[PDB]
Amino acid sequence: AALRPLVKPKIVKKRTKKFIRHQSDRYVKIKRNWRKPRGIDNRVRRRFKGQILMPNIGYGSNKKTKHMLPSGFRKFLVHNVKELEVLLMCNKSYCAEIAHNVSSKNRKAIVERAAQLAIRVTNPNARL
Amino acid sequence: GVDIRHNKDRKVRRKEPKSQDIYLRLLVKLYRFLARRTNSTFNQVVLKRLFMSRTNRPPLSLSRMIRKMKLPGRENKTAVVVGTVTDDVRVQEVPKLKVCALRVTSRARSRILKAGGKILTFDQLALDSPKGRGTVLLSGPRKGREVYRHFGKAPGTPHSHTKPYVRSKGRKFERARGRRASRGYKN
Amino acid sequence: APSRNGMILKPHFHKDWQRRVATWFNQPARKIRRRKARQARARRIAPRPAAGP
Amino acid sequence: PSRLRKTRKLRGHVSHGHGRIGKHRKHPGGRGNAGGMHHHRINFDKYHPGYFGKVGMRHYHLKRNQSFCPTVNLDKLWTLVSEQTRVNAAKNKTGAAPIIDVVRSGYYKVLGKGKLPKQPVIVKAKFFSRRAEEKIKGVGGACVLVA
RNA sequence: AGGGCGUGAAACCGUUAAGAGGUAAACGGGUGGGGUCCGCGCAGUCCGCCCGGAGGAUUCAACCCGGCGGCCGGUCCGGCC
RNA sequence: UGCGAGUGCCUAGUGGGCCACUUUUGGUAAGCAGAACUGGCGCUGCGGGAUGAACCGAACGCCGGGUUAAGGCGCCCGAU
RNA sequence: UCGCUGGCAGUCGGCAGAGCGAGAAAGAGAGUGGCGCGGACGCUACGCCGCGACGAGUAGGAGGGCCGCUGCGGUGAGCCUUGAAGCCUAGGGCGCGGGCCCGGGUGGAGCCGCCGCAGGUGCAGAUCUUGGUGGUAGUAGCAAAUAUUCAAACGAGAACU
Ligand SMILES: [Mg+2]
Ligand SMILES: [Mg+2]
Ligand SMILES: [Mg+2]
Ligand SMILES: [Mg+2]
Ligand SMILES: [Mg+2]
Ligand SMILES: [Mg+2]
Ligand SMILES: [Mg+2]
Ligand SMILES: [Mg+2]
Ligand SMILES: [Mg+2]
Ligand SMILES: [Mg+2]
Ligand SMILES: [Mg+2]
Ligand SMILES: [Mg+2]
Ligand SMILES: [Mg+2]
Ligand SMILES: [Mg+2]
Ligand SMILES: [Mg+2]
Ligand SMILES: [Mg+2]
Ligand SMILES: [Mg+2]
Ligand SMILES: [Mg+2]
Ligand SMILES: [Mg+2]
Ligand SMILES: [Mg+2]
Ligand SMILES: [Mg+2]
Ligand SMILES: [Mg+2]
Ligand SMILES: [Mg+2]
Ligand SMILES: [Mg+2]
Ligand SMILES: [Mg+2]
Ligand SMILES: [Mg+2]
Ligand SMILES: [Mg+2]
Ligand SMILES: [Mg+2]
Ligand SMILES: [Mg+2]
Ligand SMILES: [Mg+2]
């Protein structure tokens, strides 16, 4: 059994789809990263019915459940074993991550030390 | 929908000092606590002035301070300046004074101490009188800066003694046509 | 074009001022050279005053 | 620092903050301060009266060294010497008067603006004004001229 | 890495697999279906205190010896600023 | 009856406008040219007018429930 | 978001005594006579907390970016041939967004976080510059000046030698 968080409230998200840039489907030169349209005659900017939506501030997530992984934990990036004693006291709320650059032999030691300290790791069997 | 306007909803006043002086921010913490947890408006005025910029807290002079402290009634009270106390060389006799100030120039300090006065920082003022009672709050002339004689009704407009922006003052610079009566007209 | 109240100025930048701009990047080198020459003169005139007559 | 200025916030806005109706053209009013008489007339009249025209004489070879004469005031008169001088002069009952030579300090003319403390002085200057002389007389003291 | 040979992107093309196809195609919102993978899913949480039962230890409170530390002496003595 | 006010600096863009009820000048008249008052469009999406810059209603953060405006309820198409 | 320019230094604990929301100013005032050793969280105050109202926007203005790129001073007893940068991905996620973090693969030598500093710092357009690649399309076309055929040889191979 994995390590459960202190509380697991029902996470509500106002929108699950991403905000794709207008006319990013038609061209390859236009990437899906959002850019606010600024054309004078642009129907997405003028918000005509049935067009692409825009990232309002109203879509913001509940502050109590923001940045929260589906398990109920908040991510934290770890590069070496010296920065797990940091999460030693943030035990039931924050999980850990091994940075992609860490080699296998150090990733091991990080994993056993986290297991000893009861800190949850979301990528515990990454490279092997 | 509601029929209102949003032009003036946001106030413009300062909420914190714009500066990063750590001693100033400690003073602000102390006086925030005092103003919140007391019922004296003196502390509110003091921190409001702590928030201000330099042009809004001009230097105060020994001459003004001595005159305003020898005004009748306010004997042996503590003068309080949220600015700077500068020295004034055109004053001869210095009385005994009890000043509290953010900073005092060296010669002003020498004059006051030799005359037998006492100079305080705002932490000592808070320790001595939390409500600031027995104090006379002063400030420097706020419109003494040279910038203010350039403001208001534009020069070259009837009945406006406004200083113009001239590169240099002399005989050949902006003195002929809107100034004389012979050269055209006079404003 | 003039704007709201301000000063009316006369920049002398209508010639070709950029083809002749004297920078001072060699100022420390010139100071070092001058003082080295000064010391050389002072020790070539052995007992005489350094500042001259 | 370019990090803090306005060009960084205008990336992505087409006109770079200069509008679209009236573009940012090159010199839409003439170079420099042209048209002072013609189409900037009311700016020049409204903020620079007297700018156009001539007045007064001409002086072909003017010498500021000839026209040089700094001034000092009776307020600042006692600052030109040490306060030891003033204290000893006030203390002394013989009646001796200290000599205040303003040419040594670097002033040529004495103008009398403010009060003067009740103490005799011999002021040794190059020029005097009538009011300064009367104030020095009133405090009780002499004005000696030097060349 | 096979002599214009480090890495080898996009536009474009070949083939394999999956899906689909009379209102050019593509797009937004809402579901549904099918896939590829993931959960290492497949009898499902623990954490304190107390009660009861079997256990096992050099074992508790108190007392004595030594060391260290924190606060005082209404006004202990001595320093330093 | 309602409402917190006063005051100072620095300042960008703009200086091609157009439409509608009532008033109104030229013209036979005009989706013509020129004015007055108010409101709009430009800068503005949304329900209705099948369709539409300015018409009628109503002005906008992301959502659940309820109720209405103008306009509608044979079928397209929600509602006799 | 704005306003209240609202609240919180009172975590005042056996040297203790748990309060400051309630219609109507101001003392949980001081004195003078007549056993068991115990009590959650909090407050990067540039933080945390509590009420109300509000949320259209071109030209333009301002603020915040723990958005992003390159380089310098500090700093992480930082990362790395047990695999850095770069690139690909029907893999898992976070953020309203700019973007970012993991997994897999390829690759083979360097790279990044935080505090400041600096700038030749973010592209969809400009009949933009340079390089490359499509549909058109196996299409247009290979038509000025009369003309070629048979046999053999060489040759891997002959309408053309
Ligand atoms: Mg438009
Ligand atoms: Mg609203
Ligand atoms: Mg608005
Ligand atoms: Mg405003
Ligand atoms: Mg301008
Ligand atoms: Mg804009
Ligand atoms: Mg501008
Ligand atoms: Mg343009
Ligand atoms: Mg213009
Ligand atoms: Mg124009
Ligand atoms: Mg210009
Ligand atoms: Mg290779
Ligand atoms: Mg290659
Ligand atoms: Mg393919
Ligand atoms: Mg197929
Ligand atoms: Mg008309
Ligand atoms: Mg326009
Ligand atoms: Mg408007
Ligand atoms: Mg509208
Ligand atoms: Mg119709
Ligand atoms: Mg509804
Ligand atoms: Mg209908
Ligand atoms: Mg808005
Ligand atoms: Mg190599
Ligand atoms: Mg560079
Ligand atoms: Mg580019
Ligand atoms: Mg491009
Ligand atoms: Mg062919
Ligand atoms: Mg053909
Ligand atoms: Mg031919």
Side-chain angles (χ1 to χ4, degrees):
Chain A
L3 295 157
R4 289 159 218 261
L6 183 64
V7 306
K8 187 179 184 295
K10 185 178 290 294
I11 285 168
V12 172
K13 293 185 185 295
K14 289 187 197 125
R15 193 204 156 91
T16 62
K17 282 166 191 173
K18 291 177 70 68
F19 289 93
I20 64 149
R21 162 169 197 201
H22 178 215
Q23 311 218 311
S24 72
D25 56 349
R26 297 174 70 93
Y27 306 85
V28 193
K29 65 183 176 182
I30 297 279
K31 274 143 48 172
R32 63 175 65 93
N33 296 109
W34 174 253
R35 294 289 180 272
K36 185 172 176 64
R38 296 217 168 70
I40 43 170
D41 291 330
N42 189 355
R43 52 172 182 179
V44 172
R45 177 193 83 66
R46 307 160 51 197
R47 289 187 294 232
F48 279 94
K49 209 213 291 183
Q51 295 303 115
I52 292 171
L53 302 196
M54 290 201 282
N56 270 282
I57 196 73
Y59 292 88
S61 305
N62 181 327
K63 292 188 286 185
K64 298 292 180 67
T65 64
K66 188 177 181 180
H67 289 317
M68 200 152 92
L69 276 70
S71 51
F73 283 96
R74 273 78 177 275
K75 191 188 292 292
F76 194 65
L77 205 55
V78 174
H79 302 261
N80 56 4
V81 70
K82 207 190 82 53
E83 65 183 1
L84 293 172
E85 293 82 3
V86 169
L87 273 58
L88 163 69
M89 294 299 291
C90 296
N91 193 1
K92 298 317 286 312
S93 295
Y94 293 94
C95 62
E97 294 293 328
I98 299 95
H100 66 267
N101 300 117
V102 192
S103 73
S104 63
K105 100 182 171 203
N106 298 107
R107 179 177 260 92
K108 296 289 180 67
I110 292 156
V111 174
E112 292 84 4
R113 180 98 198 102
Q116 265 198 349
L117 292 177
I119 298 159
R120 185 173 177 177
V121 178
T122 74
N123 53 359
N125 43 66
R127 289 172 156 190
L128 317 181
Chain B
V2 176
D3 174 45
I4 54 174
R5 294 182 65 189
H6 306 82
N7 285 90
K8 300 289 94 175
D9 283 26
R10 184 176 65 84
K11 310 290 178 67
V12 189
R13 63 181 178 270
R14 303 184 148 207
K15 303 309 199 42
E16 65 183 1
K18 188 72 174 175
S19 166
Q20 301 289 347
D21 181 334
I22 51 162
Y23 291 92
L24 181 66
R25 302 187 94 74
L26 265 69
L27 287 179
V28 176
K29 282 205 209 84
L30 167 61
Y31 267 86
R32 282 209 203 262
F33 178 83
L34 288 177
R36 180 171 37 99
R37 278 295 291 289
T38 62
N39 60 329
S40 68
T41 60
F42 171 85
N43 299 131
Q44 294 179 356
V45 177
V46 167
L47 62 83
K48 177 172 66 68
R49 288 187 178 180
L50 286 173
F51 289 175
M52 292 173 195
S53 64
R54 291 184 63 181
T55 65
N56 296 332
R57 62 179 149 74
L60 182 63
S61 197
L62 283 175
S63 294
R64 281 187 180 273
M65 182 179 72
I66 291 169
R67 295 173 67 249
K68 301 295 184 288
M69 294 299 291
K70 70 170 69 174
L71 273 187
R74 48 185 69 163
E75 182 65 26
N76 63 24
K77 295 158 93 174
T78 288
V80 165
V81 190
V82 192
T84 301
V85 167
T86 55
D87 184 28
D88 187 308
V89 298
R90 66 180 189 274
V91 65
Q92 297 294 321
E93 182 65 26
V94 186
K96 180 180 183 294
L97 291 171
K98 182 67 68 69
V99 188
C100 178
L102 282 183
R103 63 184 292 272
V104 194
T105 54
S106 56
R107 293 179 293 173
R109 294 181 66 92
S110 182
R111 292 280 281 281
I112 295 169
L113 295 177
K114 206 70 164 203
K118 179 176 208 164
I119 300 170
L120 281 75
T121 61
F122 267 79
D123 55 355
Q124 316 180 237
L125 179 86
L127 273 190
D128 186 74
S129 63
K131 293 179 184 291
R133 64 180 61 254
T135 59
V136 178
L137 181 56
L138 319 165
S139 67
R142 200 168 290 205
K143 295 180 75 71
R145 291 187 315 142
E146 190 276 331
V147 72
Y148 279 106
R149 291 180 291 178
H150 285 307
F151 294 161
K153 189 165 180 284
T157 300
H159 310 117
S160 77
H161 314 296
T162 304
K163 211 188 175 303
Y165 289 114
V166 289
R167 180 182 57 189
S168 65
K169 184 183 285 186
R171 194 256 310 179
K172 281 183 300 172
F173 313 114
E174 304 210 6
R175 277 204 146 73
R177 189 207 163 212
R179 299 296 217 199
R180 297 296 160 132
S182 73
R183 269 71 172 177
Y185 65 94
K186 184 159 155 82
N187 55 351
Chain C
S3 182
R4 300 180 186 91
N5 190 2
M7 179 171 314
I8 49 179
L9 304 158
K10 298 293 183 182
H12 294 55
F13 282 124
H14 301 85
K15 308 174 165 183
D16 209 312
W17 60 279
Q18 298 197 15
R19 293 184 293 176
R20 59 190 73 87
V21 168
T23 58
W24 281 54
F25 293 132
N26 65 320
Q27 188 194 18
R30 182 170 62 246
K31 290 182 73 173
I32 294 170
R33 185 194 310 131
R34 287 177 164 180
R35 74 191 309 268
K36 287 175 70 175
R38 196 167 315 122
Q39 303 191 8
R41 178 185 155 73
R43 78 167 86 91
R44 66 183 180 179
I45 50 181
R48 298 177 183 88
Chain D
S2 67
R3 292 176 280 101
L4 297 176
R5 70 178 65 255
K6 214 180 144 182
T7 183
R8 312 305 317 160
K9 297 291 181 70
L10 282 167
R11 290 308 200 214
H13 313 76
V14 192
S15 299
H16 214 287
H18 288 282
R20 311 155 82 107
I21 302 99
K23 274 74 71 175
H24 185 197
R25 285 285 147 78
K26 297 189 74 66
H27 285 101
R31 301 290 187 94
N33 53 15
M37 287 271 185
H38 297 277
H39 54 293
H40 305 140
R41 202 201 191 73
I42 64 179
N43 195 296
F44 274 75
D45 288 14
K46 185 151 142 55
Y47 304 105
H48 302 303
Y51 173 68
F52 296 118
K54 289 144 65 154
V55 58
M57 279 158 182
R58 278 171 299 155
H59 207 56
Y60 284 159
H61 182 220
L62 190 148
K63 282 168 256 156
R64 302 290 175 89
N65 284 44
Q66 272 165 266
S67 67
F68 169 91
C69 179
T71 64
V72 71
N73 270 296
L74 267 60
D75 291 331
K76 303 294 188 291
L77 204 48
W78 267 109
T79 316
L80 310 159
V81 299
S82 70
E83 69 275 16
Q84 183 177 138
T85 299
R86 199 168 55 74
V87 176
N88 284 2
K91 179 173 69 67
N92 170 26
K93 187 59 70 177
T94 290
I99 320 296
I100 307 298
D101 189 358
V102 310
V103 181
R104 177 200 193 141
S105 295
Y107 299 106
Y108 279 14
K109 189 177 178 69
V110 186
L111 300 171
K113 183 180 176 180
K115 289 293 288 292
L116 194 62
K118 280 73 176 175
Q119 205 160 357
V121 289
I122 313 293
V123 170
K124 188 181 291 294
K126 191 180 292 292
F127 305 92
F128 290 94
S129 66
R130 185 178 64 81
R131 296 180 192 57
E133 183 178 1
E134 66 183 1
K135 305 199 168 182
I136 292 151
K137 293 291 294 297
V139 65
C143 285
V144 295
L145 284 173
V146 300

